[PDB]
């Protein structure tokens, strides 16, 4: 009231509550923007991971794809033959 | 006991599925857990949950798990709770019910709000044998409580969890991650929670006020006995002087299983809010590096 | 509905039911529950059910198949039947005759085509339906009208699968259930790898790599503009007093618990 | 009684000071109120007794019941005029005395069939005039006790009731919520009421469709967006009592969930009720709920409400929402 002035925002200590109306919406005040600022680095950089299309890490993806899909066909019928022996292990443990 | 608990991937995603559809405001919702225990490791591969209201429901599904050649041996039971408070007499009564059938049995208490703000909270704890000891003899009595000693560090021991899968899930993890919408993982580093911290401390404050209630009456039980011991020793000196010249109820204490139950419940506040403490303080101190070049 | 919305709780439940099988048969018939907005077919939970495998004959146990719909009906009433999955990208004479069973119960049954592996491909999942009409003498020509299956994630599902995602960067598919501040420090390592891609291209897009400049140019300027500006004197009143708040609850919880413990050293006498 | 009121009335004209000044110092009483206690009030105690005996003797029959059901609505007409306040509680207790004895005594040859819809429809005529007259006597808990007894009859009869009873039943519970300071639950009956009053008369008008559909938005835009008080719940050591005591208040209305304002404005643009609206109030969802125009909402949304303050005589039924939208405008 000394210069009759209202001030919106301008208080950077404020921990925001859960039960506010999120109504008609703009960029918020900075007490909602100095908090949740590590997210904006975390969100847009992984969106920026697309826009390069970087060619070296793509080959580490597909070799990790090819080794993983062939790890199934190499390790197939070795878990299912032990789970059948684990299936018999139930019928001796439950009778125990 | 059990030194290790280990999961297959099917138990956790159906544990989310009873939170994701079924109860949303705050519901205790609960299940069974499943698996065989190969030596020194409790292997979990399955669950099926229970709606909000029994053994006939539990046992009928056991034939169903046998119909498809899937493992059908009940190990333990899980339950969803609020922020830090799962410790009740009712789950511990429903845990020693399952500690009695099989010698190894578990709670994995799934807290859906601590996951949504941060780290994964499933609390895979097991019963200590000395708390198995006091209920088998069924003496909830303070005189055997000190011989069969229970102090609050072995009140719920914790079994560490290691994630296990087949490699076709790793195919399907590699299959899904490429073909998907880009879901950014940002929700860990959130850096505003004071009502997640607030209701953590406010649910703590009523139990310490419950603990304040317990030791204020513990004065009065001593104020009951300190009068009555001297009054009966006044009645000792009253009645022993009487027969030379010629020639009652003691109170119970507050029943001391609730006084151990409150300290172990306040033990749940103490581990989590101080793990909550540097959790936010780490993202505060990485944000010291975020403002650090900006003049 | 033209687009199916699956949820990834179905797919590992296919695979863990694919690995525990009767020996030699190919497929597991079983039905699914979910909801509809008539452009978005959501399917939410799954089971396995056996069948008998024979020549031109797959014998589905219509008393068992009605049972698991009723058994999950006790879990929730609010889930209608939208369809069944069948494994393989191959369709034998078995798979048509099963699809016409669930149309007497009559949804339009919303079918899914799941692989074990395409041999030079990948897991290739497609969303099928059956609907046709008849010419009376020989009405036996029929094909599958396919639609798109796309998964959907919720916030506790998408924070929950990220630790189930970390099975893949591990030798024997194990991570022991993780700590908080190593996961805070891993989030800095999540930053440190993701910083590396834009900066390595930054010395590329400075010097010559300027052909598609503007699409990465519009995004790197907005990342630096979406973060707001204070002079750091404003920050330490926010930061270090919150540090004086978080250090306060570290003392005060240990103020309490040492008096929980010294009460416990008093009552255990 | 009507003769004895007048003979006490002209006694006031018959009569018109130290004996009046002392009695004003203990209890304020008119000279009409003194003479009514001598002459009239012994008769109305008999007149109240003459209804109340004849209820309890004619109860629980099946073939006299038009006389029983009309003798309750005759008696409510009485206590409206002669202002028996404690005797309205005396009628409520014997009313439920009939309610328990219907449930046990089904065995008689004249015992009453409570899944038969006509006799239960007169029970809905019996209980609704209690709600109609407790409005007129300011027994606000007993008008709330009227709606408690009505919802039991929905679970006493097996078939759901007739449409024309439930039309005015949802009318009255909506009004009593507004007078009790609720505007959350005022809309929740009216959002239930738009769902109800489509299928009693489907082909009625578009103007009566204009009459019904305009009010529910003005029931929803006269919801105050700032929530209920939990400082008074914090100071008085009752916490969490407001997520209690509304699941009573929702599940005594017929719905089961607590209403909220994001969840309530969504479910009228869901049905396209704004196709069926006055076109002056069509654009209220645009301005107040969707669009960011922070200089523009002062002149624009009040321009809608100055159409409301044009006609309190042609359309008087929106005029209770005239201050309550303005509370939304400042925030």
From Swiss-Prot, chain A:
PTMs per UniProt: Phosphorylated. Phosphorylation is enhanced upon serum stimulation.
Residues the record lists as Phosphoserine modifications: 7
Compartment annotation: Cytoplasm
Disulfide bonds: none
Superkingdom of this protein's organism: Eukaryota
The protein's assembly and partners: Interacts with EIF4G1. Component of the eukaryotic translation initiation factor 3 (eIF-3) complex, which is composed of 13 subunits: EIF3A, EIF3B, EIF3C, EIF3D, EIF3E, EIF3F, EIF3G, EIF3H, EIF3I, EIF3J, EIF3K, EIF3L and EIF3M. The eIF-3 complex appears to include 3 stable modules: module A is composed of EIF3A, EIF3B, EIF3G and EIF3I; module B is composed of EIF3F, EIF3H, and EIF3M; and module C is composed of EIF3C, EIF3D, EIF3E, EIF3L and EIF3K. EIF3C of module C binds EIF3B of module A and EIF3H of module B, thereby linking the three modules.
Role summary: RNA-binding component of the eukaryotic translation initiation factor 3 (eIF-3) complex, which is required for several steps in the initiation of protein synthesis. The eIF-3 complex associates with the 40S ribosome and facilitates the recruitment of eIF-1, eIF-1A, eIF-2:GTP:methionyl-tRNAi and eIF-5 to form the 43S pre-initiation complex (43S PIC). The eIF-3 complex stimulates mRNA recruitment to the 43S PIC and scanning of the mRNA for AUG recognition.
Family: Belongs to the eIF-3 subunit A family.
Protein name as it appears in the record: Eukaryotic translation initiation factor 3 subunit A
Curated annotation (Swiss-Prot), chain B:
Disordered, as annotated region: 223-253
Domain MPN: 5-131
Keyword Phosphoprotein (UniProt): yes
Subcellular localization: Cytoplasm
TM helices/strands, residue ranges: none
GO molecular function: metal-dependent deubiquitinase activity; metallopeptidase activity; RNA binding; translation initiation factor activity
Binding partners and assembly: Component of the eukaryotic translation initiation factor 3 (eIF-3) complex, which is composed of 13 subunits: EIF3A, EIF3B, EIF3C, EIF3D, EIF3E, EIF3F, EIF3G, EIF3H, EIF3I, EIF3J, EIF3K, EIF3L and EIF3M. The eIF-3 complex appears to include 3 stable modules: module A is composed of EIF3A, EIF3B, EIF3G and EIF3I; module B is composed of EIF3F, EIF3H, and EIF3M; and module C is composed of EIF3C, EIF3D, EIF3E, EIF3K and EIF3L. EIF3C of module C binds EIF3B of module A and EIF3H of module B, thereby linking the three modules. EIF3J is a labile subunit that binds to the eIF-3 complex via EIF3B.
PANTHER family per the UniProt record, alphabetical: EUKARYOTIC TRANSLATION INITIATION FACTOR 3 -RELATED
Record's protein name: Eukaryotic translation initiation factor 3 subunit H
Organism: Homo sapiens (Human)
Swiss-Prot record, chain C:
Compartments (UniProt record): Cytoplasm
Residue ranges constituting the MPN domain according to the UniProt record: 4-134
Catalytic activity: Thiol-dependent hydrolysis of ester, thioester, amide, peptide and isopeptide bonds formed by the C-terminal Gly of ubiquitin (a 76-residue protein attached to proteins as an intracellular targeting signal)
Primary site of residence: cytoplasm
Modified residues (Phosphoserine): 170
Function of the protein: Component of the eukaryotic translation initiation factor 3 (eIF-3) complex, which is required for several steps in the initiation of protein synthesis. The eIF-3 complex associates with the 40S ribosome and facilitates the recruitment of eIF-1, eIF-1A, eIF-2:GTP:methionyl-tRNAi and eIF-5 to form the 43S pre-initiation complex (43S PIC). The eIF-3 complex stimulates mRNA recruitment to the 43S PIC and scanning of the mRNA for AUG recognition.
Protein name in the entry: Eukaryotic translation initiation factor 3 subunit F
Organism field: Homo sapiens (Human)
Swiss-Prot record, chain D:
Location(s), subcellular: Cytoplasm
GO molecular function terms listed in the Swiss-Prot or TrEMBL record: mRNA binding; receptor tyrosine kinase binding; RNA binding; structural molecule activity; translation initiation factor activity
Keyword flag Repeat: yes
Location, primary (coarse class): cytoplasm
Annotated PCI domain residues: 209-331
Keywords noted in UniProt: Acetylation, Coiled coil, Cytoplasm, Host-virus interaction, Initiation factor, Phosphoprotein, Protein biosynthesis, Repeat, RNA-binding
One Gene Ontology term, aspect cellular component: eukaryotic translation initiation factor 3 complex, eIF3e
One GO biological process term: formation of cytoplasmic translation initiation complex
Domain of life: Eukaryota
Complex and partners: Interacts with EIF4G1. Component of the eukaryotic translation initiation factor 3 (eIF-3) complex, which is composed of 13 subunits: EIF3A, EIF3B, EIF3C, EIF3D, EIF3E, EIF3F, EIF3G, EIF3H, EIF3I, EIF3J, EIF3K, EIF3L and EIF3M. The eIF-3 complex appears to include 3 stable modules: module A is composed of EIF3A, EIF3B, EIF3G and EIF3I; module B is composed of EIF3F, EIF3H, and EIF3M; and module C is composed of EIF3C, EIF3D, EIF3E, EIF3L and EIF3K. EIF3C of module C binds EIF3B of module A and EIF3H of module B, thereby linking the three modules.
Protein family according to the UniProt entry: Belongs to the eIF-3 subunit A family.
Protein name as catalogued: Eukaryotic translation initiation factor 3 subunit A
Entire-sequence positions represented here: 101 to 437 of 1382
């Amino acid at each position: 009231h000394t210069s009759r002035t209202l001030s919106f925002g301008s208080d950077l200590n404020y921990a925001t509550r859960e039960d506010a109306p999120i109504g008609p919406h703009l960029q918020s005040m900075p007490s909602e923007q100095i908090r949740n600022q590590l997210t904006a680095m975390s969100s847009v950089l992984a969106k920026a991971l697309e826009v390069i299309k970087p060619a070296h890490i793509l080959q580490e993806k597909e070799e990790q794809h090819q080794l993983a899909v062939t790890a199934y066909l190499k390790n197939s019928r070795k878990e299912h033959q032990r789970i059948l022996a684990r299936r018999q292990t139930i019928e001796e443990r439950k009778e125990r | 006991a059990v030194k290790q608990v280990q999961i297959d991937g099917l138990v956790v995603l159906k544990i989310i599925k009873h939170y994701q559809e079924e109860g949303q405001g705050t519901e205790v919702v609960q299940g069974v857990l499943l698996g065989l225990v190969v030596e020194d490791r409790l292997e979990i591969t399955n669950c099926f949950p229970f709606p909000q209201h029994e053994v006939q429901y539990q046992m009928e599904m056991m034939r169903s798990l046998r119909h498809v050649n899937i493992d059908h041996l009940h190990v333990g039971w899980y339950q969803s709770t609020y922020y830090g408070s799962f410790v009740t007499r009712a789950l511990l009564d429903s845990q020693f019910s399952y500690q009695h059938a099989i010698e190894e049995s578990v709670v994995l208490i799934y807290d859906p709000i601590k996951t949504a703000q941060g780290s994964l909270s499933l609390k895979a704890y097991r019963l200590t044998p000395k708390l198995m000891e006091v209920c088998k003899e069924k003496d909830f009595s303070p005189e055997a409580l000190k011989k069969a000693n229970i102090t609050f560090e072995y009140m719920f021991e914790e079994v560490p969890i290691v994630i296990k899968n087949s490699h076709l899930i790793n195919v399907l993890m590699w299959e899904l991650e490429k073909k998907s919408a880009v879901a950014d993982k940002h929700e860990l580093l959130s850096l505003a929670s004071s009502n997640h911290l607030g209701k953590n401390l406010q649910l703590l404050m009523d139990r310490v006020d419950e603990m304040s209630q317990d030791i204020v009456k513990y004065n009065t039980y001593m104020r009951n006995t300190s009068k009555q011991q001297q009054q009966k020793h006044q009645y000792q000196q009253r009645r022993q002087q009487e027969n030379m010249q010629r020639q009652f109820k003691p109170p119970q204490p507050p029943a001391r299983m609730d006084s151990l139950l409150i300290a172990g419940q306040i033990n749940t506040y103490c581990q989590n809010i101080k793990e909550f403490t540097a959790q936010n303080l780490g993202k505060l101190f990485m944000a010291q590096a975020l403002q650090e070049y900006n003049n | 509905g033209r687009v199916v919305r699956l949820h990834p709780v179905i797919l590992a439940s296919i695979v863990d039911s694919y690995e525990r099988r009767n020996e030699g048969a190919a497929r597991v018939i079983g039905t699914l529950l979910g909801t509809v907005d008539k452009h978005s077919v959501e399917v939410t939970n799954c089971f396995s059910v056996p069948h008998n495998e024979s020549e031109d004959e797959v014998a589905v146990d219509m008393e068992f198949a009605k049972n698991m719909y009723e058994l999950h009906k006790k879990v929730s009433p609010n889930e209608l039947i939208l369809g069944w999955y069948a494994t393989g990208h191959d369709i034998t004479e078995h798979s048509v005759l099963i699809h016409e069973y669930y149309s007497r119960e009559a949804p339009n049954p919303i079918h899914l085509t799941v692989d074990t592996s395409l041999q030079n491909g990948r897991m290739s999942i497609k969303a099928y339906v059956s609907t046709l009409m008849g010419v009376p003498g020989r009405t036996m020509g029929v094909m599958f009208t396919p639609l798109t299956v796309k998964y959907a994630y919720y916030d506790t599902e998408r924070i929950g699968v990220d630790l189930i995602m970390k099975t893949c960067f591990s030798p024997n598919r194990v991570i022991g259930l993780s700590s908080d501040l190593q996961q805070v420090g891993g989030a800095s390592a999540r930053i440190q790898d993701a910083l590396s891609t834009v900066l390595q291209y930054a010395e590329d897009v400075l010097s010559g790599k300027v052909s598609a400049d503007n699409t990465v140019g519009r995004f790197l300027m907005s990342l630096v503009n979406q973060v707001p500006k204070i002079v750091p004197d404003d920050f330490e009143t926010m930061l270090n007093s919150n540090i004086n708040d978080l250090l306060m609850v570290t003392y005060l919880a240990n103020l309490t618990q040492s008096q929980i413990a010294l009460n416990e050293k008093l009552v255990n006498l | 009684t009507e003769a004895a009121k007048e003979e006490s009335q002209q006694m006031v004209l018959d009569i018109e000071t130290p004996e009046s000044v002392l009695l004003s110092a203990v209890s304020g009483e008119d000279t009409q109120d003194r003479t009514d206690r001598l002459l009239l009030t012994p008769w109305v105690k008999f007149l109240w007794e003459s209804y109340r005996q004849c209820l309890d003797l004619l109860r629980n029959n099946s073939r006299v019941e038009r006389l029983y059901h009309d003798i309750a609505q005759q008696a409510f007409k009485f206590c409206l005029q002669y202002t028996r306040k404690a005797e309205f509680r005396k009628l409520c207790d014997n009313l439920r005395m009939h309610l328990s004895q219907i449930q046990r005594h089904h065995n008689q040859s004249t015992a009453i069939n409570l899944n038969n819809p006509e006799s239960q429809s007169m029970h809905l005529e019996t209980r609704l005039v209690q709600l109609d007259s407790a409005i007129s006597m300011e027994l606000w808990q007993e008008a709330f006790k009227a709606v408690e007894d009505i919802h039991g009859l929905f679970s006493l009869s097996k078939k759901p009731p007739k449409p024309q009873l439930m039309a005015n039943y949802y009318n009255k519970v909506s009004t009593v919520f507004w007078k009790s300071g609720n505007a959350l639950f005022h809309a929740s009956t009216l959002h239930r009421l738009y769902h109800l009053s489509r299928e009693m008369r489907k082909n009625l008008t578009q103007d009566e469709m204009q009459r019904m559909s305009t009010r529910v938005l003005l029931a929803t835009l006269s919801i105050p967006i700032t929530p209920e008080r939990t400082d008074i719940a914090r100071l008085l050591d009752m916490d969490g009592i407001i997520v209690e005591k509304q699941r009573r208040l929702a599940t005594l209305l017929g719905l089961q969930a607590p209403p909220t304002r994001i969840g309530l404005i969504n479910d009228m643009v869901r049905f396209n009720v704004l196709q069926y609206v006055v076109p002056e109030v069509k654009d209220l969802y645009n301005w107040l709920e969707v669009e960011f125009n922070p200089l523009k909402l002062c002149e624009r949304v009040t321009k809608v409400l100055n159409w409301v303050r044009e006609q309190p005589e042609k359309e008087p039924e929106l005029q209770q929402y005239v201050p309550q939208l303005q509370n939304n405008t400042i925030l």
